[PDB]
From Swiss-Prot, chain B:
Subcellular location: Nucleus
Domain remark text: The C-terminal domain (CTD) serves as a platform for assembly of factors that regulate transcription initiation, elongation, termination and mRNA processing.
Family membership noted in the UniProt record: Belongs to the RNA polymerase beta' chain family.
Assembly, per entry: Component of the RNA polymerase II (Pol II) complex consisting of 12 subunits. Interacts with DEF1; the interaction is direct and serves to bridge RPB1 to the Elongin complex in a DNA-damaged dependent manner. Interacts with the Elongin subunit ELA1. Interacts with the Elongin subunit ELC1. Interacts with ASK10. Interacts with ESS1. Interacts with RTT103. Interacts with SHE2.
Gene behind this protein: RPO21
Post-translational modification as stated in the protein's UniProt record: The tandem 7 residues repeats in the C-terminal domain (CTD) can be highly phosphorylated. The phosphorylation activates Pol II. Phosphorylation occurs mainly at residues 'Ser-2' and 'Ser-5' of the heptapeptide repeat. The phosphorylated form of Pol II appears to carry, on average, one phosphate per repeat. The phosphorylation state is believed to result from the balanced action of site-specific CTD kinases and phosphatases, and a 'CTD code' that specifies the position of Pol II within the transcription cycle has been proposed.
Span within the parent record: 1399 to 1445 of 1733
UniProt protein name: DNA-directed RNA polymerase II subunit RPB1
Native source organism of the sequence: Saccharomyces cerevisiae (strain ATCC 204508 / S288c)
Swiss-Prot record, chain C:
Coiled coil: none
This protein's GO CC annotations: nucleus; transcription preinitiation complex
The keyword Membrane belongs to this UniProt entry's keyword annotation: no
Top-level taxonomy: Eukaryota, Fungi, Dikarya, Ascomycota, Saccharomycotina
Residues engaged in binding Zn(2+): 8, 11, 29, 32
Transmembrane segments: none
Zinc finger (TFIIB-type): 4-37
Top-rank taxon, per record: Eukaryota
Subunit comment: Associates with TFIID-IIA (DA complex) to form TFIID-IIA-IIB (DAB-complex) which is then recognized by polymerase II.
Protein's name in the database: Transcription initiation factor IIB
Curated annotation (Swiss-Prot), chain H:
Entry binding sites for Mg(2+) 1: 474, 476, 478
Name listed for the protein in its UniProt record: DNA-directed RNA polymerase II subunit RPB1
Upper classification of the organism: Eukaryota, Fungi, Dikarya, Ascomycota, Saccharomycotina
UniProt organism field: Saccharomyces cerevisiae (strain ATCC 204508 / S288c)
Chain residue ranges for the region called Lid loop: 241-253
Protein's cellular compartments: Nucleus
Curated annotation (Swiss-Prot), chain I:
Full-protein positions shown: 540 to 686 of 1224
Cellular compartment(s): Nucleus
Miscellaneous comment as given in the Swiss-Prot or TrEMBL entry: The binding of ribonucleoside triphosphate to the RNA polymerase II transcribing complex probably involves a two-step mechanism. The initial binding seems to occur at the entry (E) site and involves a magnesium ion coordinated by three conserved aspartate residues of the two largest RNA Pol II subunits. Present with 18700 molecules/cell in log phase SD medium.
Stated role: DNA-dependent RNA polymerase catalyzes the transcription of DNA into RNA using the four ribonucleoside triphosphates as substrates. Second largest component of RNA polymerases II which synthesizes mRNA precursors and many functional non-coding RNAs. Proposed to contribute to the polymerase catalytic activity and forms the polymerase active center together with the largest subunit. Pol II is the central component of the basal RNA polymerase II transcription machinery.
Gene name in the database record: RPB2
Protein name: DNA-directed RNA polymerase II subunit RPB2
Organism of this sequence: Saccharomyces cerevisiae (strain ATCC 204508 / S288c)
Top-level taxon of origin: Eukaryota
UniProt record similarity statement: Belongs to the RNA polymerase beta chain family.
Assembly mode: Component of the RNA polymerase II (Pol II) complex consisting of 12 subunits.
Amino acid sequence: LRFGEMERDCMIAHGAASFLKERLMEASDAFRVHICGICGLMTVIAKLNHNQFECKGCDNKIDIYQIHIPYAAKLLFQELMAMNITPRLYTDRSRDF
Amino acid sequence: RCSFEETVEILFEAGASAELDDCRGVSENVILGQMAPIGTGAFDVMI
Amino acid sequence: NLNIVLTCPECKVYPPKIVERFSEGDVVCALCGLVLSDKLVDTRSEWRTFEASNPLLDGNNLSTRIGKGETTDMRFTKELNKAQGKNVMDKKDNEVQAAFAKITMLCDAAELPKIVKDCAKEAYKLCHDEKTLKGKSMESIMAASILIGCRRAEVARTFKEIQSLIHVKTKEFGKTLNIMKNILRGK
Amino acid sequence: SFNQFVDYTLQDIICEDSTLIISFGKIYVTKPMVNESDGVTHALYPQEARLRNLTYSSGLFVDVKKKVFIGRLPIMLRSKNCYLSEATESDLYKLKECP
Amino acid sequence: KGSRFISTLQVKLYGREGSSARTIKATLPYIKQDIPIVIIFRALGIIPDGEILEHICYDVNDWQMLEMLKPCVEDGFVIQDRETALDFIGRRGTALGIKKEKRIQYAKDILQKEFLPHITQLEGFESRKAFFLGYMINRLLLCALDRKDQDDRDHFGKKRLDLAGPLLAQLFKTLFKKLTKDIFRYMQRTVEEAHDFNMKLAINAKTITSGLKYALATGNWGEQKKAMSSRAGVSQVLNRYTYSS
Amino acid sequence: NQEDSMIMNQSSIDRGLFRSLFFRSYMDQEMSITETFEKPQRTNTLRMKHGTYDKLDDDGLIAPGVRVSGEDVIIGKTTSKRDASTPLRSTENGIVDQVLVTTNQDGLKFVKVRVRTTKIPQIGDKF
Amino acid sequence: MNAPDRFELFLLGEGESKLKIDPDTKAPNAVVITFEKEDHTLGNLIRAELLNDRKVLFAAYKVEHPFFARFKLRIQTTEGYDPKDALKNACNSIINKLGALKTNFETEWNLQTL
Amino acid sequence: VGQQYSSAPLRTVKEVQFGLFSPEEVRAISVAKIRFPETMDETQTRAKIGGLNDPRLGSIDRNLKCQTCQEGMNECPGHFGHIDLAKPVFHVGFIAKIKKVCECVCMHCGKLLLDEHNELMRQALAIKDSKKRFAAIWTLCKTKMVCETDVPSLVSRGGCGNTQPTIRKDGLKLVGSWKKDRATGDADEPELRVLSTEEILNIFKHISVKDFTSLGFNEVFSRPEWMILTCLPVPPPPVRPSISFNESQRGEDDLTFKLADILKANISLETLEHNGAPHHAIEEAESLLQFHVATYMDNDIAGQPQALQKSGRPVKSIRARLKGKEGRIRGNLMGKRVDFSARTVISGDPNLELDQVGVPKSIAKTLTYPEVVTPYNIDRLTQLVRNGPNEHPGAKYVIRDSGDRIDLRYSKRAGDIQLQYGWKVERHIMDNDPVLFNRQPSLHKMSMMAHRVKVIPYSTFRLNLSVTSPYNADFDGDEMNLHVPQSEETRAELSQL
Amino acid sequence: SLMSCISVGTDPMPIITFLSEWGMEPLEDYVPHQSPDATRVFVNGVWHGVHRNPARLMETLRTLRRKGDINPEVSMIRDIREKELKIFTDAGRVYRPLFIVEDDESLGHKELKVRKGHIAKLMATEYQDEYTWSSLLN
Amino acid sequence: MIVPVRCFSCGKVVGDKWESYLNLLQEDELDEGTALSRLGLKRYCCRRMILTHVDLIEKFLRYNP
Ligand SMILES: [Zn+2]
Ligand SMILES: [Zn+2]
Ligand SMILES: [Zn+2]
Ligand SMILES: [Zn+2]
Ligand SMILES: [Zn+2]
């Protein structure tokens, strides 16, 4: 069933933050993606068995992160790149500066 | 701004001018499916 | 090497149907009674007319053909209809297309059935390639795709009558009757 | 409105820039026909056409000067052309059509 | 009957209450501008002022209206003959190179077949059309002088309802035309071979039958176009839940 | 019966008050690549359904009297042998009323299976 | 499709006894007897008869929901008088009257012609 | 979530650095090369050519193969391909931007039209917003159409007094007018020419760091030279899926079609420049590659729509995907179809408590809740396991440590069952369970409220009447939604808030 | 509505003809200041001329509609004060039936043309299940 | 579509009374009102059953197969 825009706002109104994440993730879109620690892209080749990862063109074999995002999100980001836009994802609020 | 009317263009103008997103917005945490600075996500619980 | 399997893991049987389920999905074995993935792939839900395509010769793409009433094509229609009409000259574009368009004109006129009327036109595209004593006349092998096209039901033939129609019912029809017997015995 | 299209409008549509640089004359409309493979032309009825997923359409013949078949015009279930237009009550029940 | 061309004409009244010289202009099809009424009138044969204003104002004692027309004359006083009035169009959306001659005919053709197409599309009916343009401008000014209200858009006796007949008619045309044109194509190609009658013919069979079907079957009243939002769902599957429905 | 709900005499309902019939008809059609009505049995494909094929006859059609439900297979189709057969709609269930085997112009095998149920006024039924 | 079976209105299932006696906690000498597969017909008849006893301080009943055929009967009696006996007595008084009703009716019916 | 372990650390996204793909990085990232506009067939033989969707990208037919990453059509984040265009092409979303940059920088030497010398310019350079800088600087030097050699402090700067063009948008191109030869050379008319891509490239490649800074450009994440598409990224199979309706033919996607159109338009161009080059007759194919590359991303502009008669026409172009309502962001990211919901007609029940909700038995049996096997419950839980998914106080599925799922309706795991501690028992929604019940439209906090469950017969959601006005419902046939919290914290958040 | 119908379209020509045979001074020879009290006639949006004494024309026309000579569908509007007479023969005008009240009745006042005698003639057809609806229109 | 056996509200047998009612209309030449009352149908619940029933079955029977 549709848990569209409006239903979300109510949950935000109640302040029900965890429930909101379980609804928009754990029920529906829930996907795991590997990310380059350097260029926030989904360009990591996932070789789960030889622990081999690689980013190529970044040469990351060490600096790689795993995230939990909704598959629709993963699509939006990929479709952006498809349009030459880079949605770089970083795993630290401590902004560079 | 994505979530409202001028989605595509907003992203373009944002990509063009290298915008950094804090990710401290409710609507932004929803897109990434994480807890947001809402009631339950305004404090951190530790041991 | 591509190996794809659903083997339960716990009690390998090598191998048995695991169910498609009705609502839950995941194909749990009636053996170890475990799970495999989450499925999440509805094949019944194909792209309707509301994007899907059923190509029989190569791969269909399309270009231009603008008609949306937003801004008039006028100047731009001729800009793009000429520009796409220049491109259908680069690498032997004509031949299969000419054959299939002329094919749908000769059958439609005699009202040949689409389901098997189109079936024989696929046979022609298999016969136009391969080089086996065709002594090809275009019209000749067309009377083969006029016979197998009428093979759907006796729609217009009475194939002899459609042979007696128009031109070339004799020796050139003989070359063609042979080509069909050779194509049928070709595995 | 449909009887006006069959009887008049339709004949008027044939006569315009019809003559070529071949002229078309009177145009006739038979009662719904069935052109099927493996057999004769059959007289179609509303009921048969609804069950078999057919098009209740009739012969549209033209008189070409230098008689000639041109398409099928789906008929409005009760116009001058439809068999039901004249059918009686007992007839309708026999054609499996609600009176 | 026959084709059913829709080319609206617009007599505009430039200038609001109390502006400097309220001018009256008109919007023609396939022309990238507007032309003051006096000019179209002289282009129709009616040259002199007053003979023009006799086609508009139906009383010489109505100085009020005749006064409003004064600034109209002012525009056209640049042109005094049928040739220049046909020429003030300089054709239009066709222009650049051609000098005269070519353009004048484009104009004649427009005032014949594309301008006020109902009434008559023939040749020698200029006075009938001129008189109507007048009447149009009279109705325009009647509402500009506050003598008569604005036209009521919602008046039902000014609206129509296209049933089975008229719709099928539109379609039948398009498909009968696409037919007649394919005949011209199969007419060609045969550079000779003498007889070529058997080759032609039997086309109308399929083309018309699929077009009559496809529309009545879908709701797209256009055949493979759909870009024509006539697809608005004419021909819907019949309601059958209750007798009354 | 507040806010536009209504209490109904269950006893009248038992006597037939406001019962209705409900027919729903499913339908299906058919170079040397032809579809066929039949009772499939794998080979070697395996693309089949959860539904029960046991109620179907050899022609791939269910006979009238047969009572159906859930996802039961109403028409069996096959084309080496990928299934493409219309089961009954998941929530529905009733009794096969009639089956009809026709020919659409292009010598196609046409099949309409009608299914009948009787719907009795229940608590959520709108009046 | 969620409708219960019609016989669940008078046929006790598994682990359902006609009666369930639970001592009330509010008052003294008070008892809530749950009736299974019974409706107003009994509930109201037993309540009314229980009110005729001059040693009965309280007696009510209630179908807690129309969906399930079951009711509760609360009874409170004077010290020393068991509510269960009050119940019995009621039940008996009920059977007697009905007994009389039966014969008196049967007597009049015979005296009738048609 | 449901996938395999990883030695990679799990993290939360904290920043989103937006930018543009350098034609260098597109190649450095890519794995494909894409030569052929065909898809699968090789003399009929089914597979996939090194053209579209194949060389190293994801797959179809349930094949694990995918850039040595294995995993298969699930957990394969699609991988990006590569595709080199002949003559560089403009990007539809940036045309608008590209004019504004051209009108703001002088052609040839690629310098700003104004320096700190102009006091109006000084004020505009102090502003700290990409939006405001680039807009203020534009409005301040769009008028000027001469590259000043000398300005009063006369001071000296960039030397090349060439006249600037007055740029106008026509279709997918930029045409400019000049004003030169001082009424002696020629006679009167300007020099109307079309500004090609290769020109704009050099200009934008030759502008310096501090001219980027002045404009909304990072130099690292966005250089103006990248608003122009040299190298085009190819989106993997997961963005553009396949599979059909019958099962004997293709059944392809729209994006793929336009990508094939891009390739044909690109191949025929490379053809003319190597073999027979008929000069200014080639440009008729460049604007086609410009049209497809641009149309692949947008098909509502001011030019002309798209194909094809059949399919879903006109096509989609990524724009249509992302676009608000019924598309990604609106109908996929911030509004999803969630699991564990239920909908029915509602009715009044006056014997319910305010805070309850009558859930019809059937819905209770379908809706599940993942509770953890615990000494506090084993008895109750084990008992449910035995009641099975066809009796109300039962259960379906039983989860373990690893992640196996023992379907209970199919044969599960042997005889009397032996529940182990830590396992999870998806158990039917029982009485008193917290649930989020709502009626749409949800324009309130009141439209979304947690209720105590009460499992009843018949198939209608039954609610207390006093709860009527906050959902703004009545029982004329109103339907309502139900959601079941899945976590132990998530329950707490419904019964506490 | 229950009684509404729609115009199907008649030929305009036989009326345009009939007009100029009963006045209808053709628009070619119109002298506005010479005939001020004159009414201007319209057929299907076209101005076909002018006509003094439109009052007699009007009655003639309505009688021909009611006798059956001019198709009943055809609508005829006389805006007396406007000095205009518009005839429509267009296809697609919604229309409805009405009783006629023409006061032509010597035995007192204004009355409906239909009478009790026409009705027992109508009900006479009903009982046989020759007086139709058309016969009430004719 | 046939006479309802037993009225919905009362439950009194009503299916056995249709031909009797039809006869009292046609031949006896009575008014619906009295016809019902002579059949024992005194109360409006058991009365609307017969008065309101449309014997559609008589038209369904006219279909040949
Ligand atoms: Zn990297
Ligand atoms: Zn197993
Ligand atoms: Zn992968
Ligand atoms: Zn310069
Ligand atoms: Zn009754």
